[PDB]
Amino acid sequence: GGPSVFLFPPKPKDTLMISRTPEVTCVVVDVSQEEPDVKFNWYVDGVEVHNAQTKPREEQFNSTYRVVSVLTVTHQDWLNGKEYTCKVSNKALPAPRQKTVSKTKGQPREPQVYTLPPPREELTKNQVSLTCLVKGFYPSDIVVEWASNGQPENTYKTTPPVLDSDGSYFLYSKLTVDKSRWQQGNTFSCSVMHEALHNHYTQKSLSLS
Amino acid sequence: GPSVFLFPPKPKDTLMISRTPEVTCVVVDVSQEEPDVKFNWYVDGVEVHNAQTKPREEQFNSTYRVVSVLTVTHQDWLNGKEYTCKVSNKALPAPRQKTVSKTKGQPREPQVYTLPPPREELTKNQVSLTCLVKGFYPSDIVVEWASNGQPENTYKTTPPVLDSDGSYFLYSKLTVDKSRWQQGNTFSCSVMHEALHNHYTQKSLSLSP
Ligand SMILES: *[C@@H]1O[C@H](CO[C@@H]2O[C@@H](C)[C@@H](O)[C@@H](O)[C@@H]2O)[C@@H](O[C@@H]2O[C@H](CO)[C@@H](O[C@@H]3O[C@H](CO[C@H]4O[C@H](CO)[C@@H](O)[C@H](O)[C@@H]4O[C@@H]4O[C@H](CO)[C@@H](O)[C@H](O)[C@H]4NC(C)=O)[C@@H](O)[C@H](O[C@H]4O[C@H](CO)[C@@H](O)[C@H](O)[C@@H]4O[C@@H]4O[C@H](CO)[C@@H](O)[C@H](O)[C@H]4NC(C)=O)[C@@H]3O)[C@H](O)[C@H]2NC(C)=O)[C@H](O)[C@H]1NC(C)=O
Numbered sequence: 449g450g451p452s453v454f455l456f457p458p459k460p461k462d463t464l465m466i467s468r469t470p471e472v473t474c475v476v477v478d479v480s481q482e483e484p485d486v487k488f489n490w491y492v493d494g495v496e497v498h499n500a501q502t503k504p505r506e507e508q509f510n511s512t513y514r515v516v517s518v519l520t521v522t523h524q525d526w527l528n529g530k531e532y533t534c535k536v537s538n539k540a541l542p543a544p545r546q547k548t549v550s551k552t553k554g555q556p557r558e559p560q561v562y563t564l565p566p567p568r569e570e571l572t573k574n575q576v577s578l579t580c581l582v583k584g585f586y587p588s589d590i591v592v593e594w595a596s597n598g599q600p601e602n603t604y605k606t607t608p609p610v611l612d613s614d615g616s617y618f619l620y621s622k623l624t625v626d627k628s629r630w631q632q633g634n635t636f637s638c639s640v641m642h643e644a645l646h647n648h649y650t651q652k653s654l655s656l657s
Numbered sequence: 658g659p660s661v662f663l664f665p666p667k668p669k670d671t672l673m674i675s676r677t678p679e680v681t682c683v684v685v686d687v688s689q690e691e692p693d694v695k696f697n698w699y700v701d702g703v704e705v706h707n708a709q710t711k712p713r714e715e716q717f718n719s720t721y722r723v724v725s726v727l728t729v730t731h732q733d734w735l736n737g738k739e740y741t742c743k744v745s746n747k748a749l750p751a752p753r754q755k756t757v758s759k760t761k762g763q764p765r766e767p768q769v770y771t772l773p774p775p776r777e778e779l780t781k782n783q784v785s786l787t788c789l790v791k792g793f794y795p796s797d798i799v800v801e802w803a804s805n806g807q808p809e810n811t812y813k814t815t816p817p818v819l820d821s822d823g824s825y826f827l828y829s830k831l832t833v834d835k836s837r838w839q840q841g842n843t844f845s846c847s848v849m850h851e852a853l854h855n856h857y858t859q860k861s862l863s864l865s866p
């Protein structure tokens with residue numbers, strides 16, 4: 449039971465947000481200490497690449513080694529459907545262990561986004577919750593965030609994706625705001641980024657009417 | 658050697674008079690060399706003997722798996738009693754034990770708010786009614802719908818999500834027909850949680866105006 453390889457995809461935030469840089473990460477574990485120097489080979493649609501940043505053999509608590517390599521991807525390359533292979537070689541193993549990862553397959557379904565105001569029985573309280581329903585999207589990789597009067601917010605929570613009755617997912621975002629600022633005529637904005645949208649972004653608005 | 662895992666009753670079982678809640682003791686990794694296992698059950702440090710120990714399962718790993726189920730009283734589980742499963746073998750240097758009890762913390766009753774379908778959703782034949790349930794501790798809860806008294810089969814609920822103040826929240830979504838929403842049919846979101854009166858509350862919705 450020697451080396452074990454695990455390949456992880458980039459984070460949806462990174463793939464969807466232009467200014468970021470998404471990464472694909474190869475993790476080798478249980479590298480035992482007789483022969484602990486491991487060599488990485490990276491392939492993109494079967495073409496070798498060499499621009500990954502391989503880390504040095506970190507130690508572990510179970511007196512095993514854990515080596516990591518990070519390959520930079522370009523946004524459109526990941527969302528075009530290319531496939532990323534990590535082939536890992538170590539002196540103590542029969543034939544190099546390999547793993548591939550690529551974008552979740554299935555025909556992309558675009559999310560419908562809706563904004564829900566506070567219920568009637570919540571106005572008695574000091575703070576009110578605005579709701580953002582995001583439903584009908586596939587794949588499940590999604591980013592949702594709020595912003596009020598042009599500039600961001602931090603005070604919000606988003607449920608994990610929930611599989612719906614028809615192979616699509618949905619989620620809810622919640623934003624706690626002060627009833628004073630809600631009923632004094634301020635606009636809030638729910639914004640979602642997902643691969644199937646126009647410019648990978650759309651946003652709905654909410655404001656007392 | 659073996660491994661013991663003690664699992665608590667399901668929340669539905671505890672919250673519902675009709676159901677019967679159970680604590681489940683699982684033992685894994687029991688070698689075929691000495692494969693006979695036995696259970697002692699203690700409740701608040703008092704030995705019970707009314708458990709239902711099953712025969713010893715076989716497993717693919719070339720190991721065995723034994724299970725023992727103990728019935729509990731609804732009120733007993735909700736009073737904070739502690740449930741100990743003491744497992745002894747022959748290849749065990751000494752008996753292993755696990756204990757389990759209610760999630761400790763100060764119970765906080767949930768707030769239930771019903772939400773109608775958004776402005777821009779009403780162009781479709783199908784319409785989403787949403788239950789917001791917030792500010793409850795612990796996370797163990799059971800949410801279900803009904804319309805005009807009759808149970809619904811077609812709703813999806815979020816996992817519990819931790820909020821900024823240690824309490825949890827969740828959202829439940831029932832999909833019904835535009836026709837039957839516009840038809841002044843009342844729907845009802847009901848929630849069962851230990852911190853409520855009668856471990857139950859219900860808030861309803863319909864085309865109010
Ligand atoms: C020695 O120690 C090392 C490290 O120590 C570890 O960390 C410290 C904190 C300790 O306290 C301990 O917690 C722990 O020991 C151990 O290294 C760990 O080893 C395990 C297995 O040996 C790794 O595997 C994990 O497995 C699950 C699920 O993944 C697949 O593999 C399972 C096989 O065991 C299988 O049962 C699953 O079903 C699943 O199978 C996959 O299924 C899909 C289906 O869609 C299929 O397509 C795949 O082909 C199939 N793959 C198969 C079969 O191989 C999971 O728990 C692990 O991923 C995450 O695990 C943790 C949860 O987040 C987290 O620790 C990890 O970081 C990882 O999270 C991701 O990390 C990357 C970068 O690291 C990051 O970019 C991501 O954002 C992040 N994601 C999230 C959500 O956080 C993993 O798949 C563990 O990964 C591995 N952990 C580490 C840190 O190396 C070692 O086992 C010990 N050895 C011994 C002998 O004890």
Ligand SMILES: *[C@@H]1O[C@H](CO[C@@H]2O[C@@H](C)[C@@H](O)[C@@H](O)[C@@H]2O)[C@@H](O[C@@H]2O[C@H](CO)[C@@H](O[C@@H]3O[C@H](CO[C@H]4O[C@H](CO)[C@@H](O)[C@H](O)[C@@H]4O[C@@H]4O[C@H](CO)[C@@H](O)[C@H](O)[C@H]4NC(C)=O)[C@@H](O)[C@H](O[C@H]4O[C@H](CO)[C@@H](O)[C@H](O)[C@@H]4O[C@@H]4O[C@H](CO)[C@@H](O)[C@H](O)[C@H]4NC(C)=O)[C@@H]3O)[C@H](O)[C@H]2NC(C)=O)[C@H](O)[C@H]1NC(C)=O
Pocket residue numbers: 660662664665667681683685686716717718720722
């Ligand atoms: C032989 O095979 C058996 C079984 O085969 C298994 O299933 C088949 C399908 C295979 O294909 C494989 O998938 C798999 O091998 C193997 O036996 C299994 O072995 C593992 C570990 O050896 C057991 O692990 C699981 O453990 C989690 C929690 O893990 C605890 O320990 C971790 C470290 O070991 C630690 O990191 C965790 O945090 C956790 O530790 C606890 O943490 C809490 C934190 O609050 C703390 O309070 C505790 O004090 C602390 N305690 C300890 C000791 O660490 C456990 O939660 C899992 O239980 C449920 O979830 C599984 C799915 O993830 C599910 O399969 C289980 O059946 C179980 O399901 C529950 O069942 C009850 C009643 O039956 C029901 O009421 C629940 O609703 C239900 N819930 C769910 C979600 O299913 C899990 O147990 C496995 O239990 C164990 N046996 C199984 C899976 O039957 C064995 O390894 C194989 N042999 C070899 C050599 O490998």
